[PDB]
Amino acid sequence: MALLENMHIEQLARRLPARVQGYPWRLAYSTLEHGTSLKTLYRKSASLDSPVLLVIKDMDNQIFGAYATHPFKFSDHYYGTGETFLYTFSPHFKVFKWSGENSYFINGDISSLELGGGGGRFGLWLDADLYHGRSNSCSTFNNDILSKKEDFIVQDLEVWAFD
């Protein structure tokens, strides 16, 4: 609603897996509304029992993020399944799905949150303030850089669930 226009919702809805098709979208976490901190993200994502949609709008107004099969949580380990993918609308809408090379889907930490893994790199990286973000090409999704540069700044960030 606030970060996405009808253009974004339709192109995203067409690439969501079958198990969430026709499930209404519930806003679970929002930087605009809840307090900008990875800690707060964890608290709102706690007691979520569904896959989530991560929506990032950076300081260049470009929109990208991820669909995750499980709520974001602090984890000793990588978790999630292969239905997880990354997406960007810059320079055009493109979805980077599981490549089958590894299973390093989601990794929650106290200092950072990252999706994708393998040999050090990652697909998406956010710091504890949900401020400095980073995006590289990773083996989990074989994505290109979701943002303009490798480094980006989070302007607004939303997490949507499918209760």
Residue numbers in the entry: 21 to 183
Passage from the reporting paper:
Here, the current status of the fully automated ambient-temperature beamline VMXi at Diamond Light Source is described, and a highly efficient pipeline from protein sample to final multi-crystal data analysis and structure determination is shown. The VMXi beamline and its associated PXF within the Research Complex at Harwell offer a highly automated pipeline where researchers provide a suitable protein sample that is used for robotic crystallization, monitoring and subsequent in situ data collection from crystals in crystallization plates or in thin-film sample delivery systems. Here we present illustrative examples of data measured using VMXi from a variety of proteins comprising both conventional crystallographic standards and ‘real world’ user samples. Routine RT data collection provides a useful capability that is highly relevant to studying protein dynamics and ligand binding without the complication of cryo-cooling.
Plates were set up yielding crystal hits for the NCOA7 protein under the 96 screening conditions. Comparison between the RT structure and cryo-structures was not feasible due to difference in crystallization condition and space group.
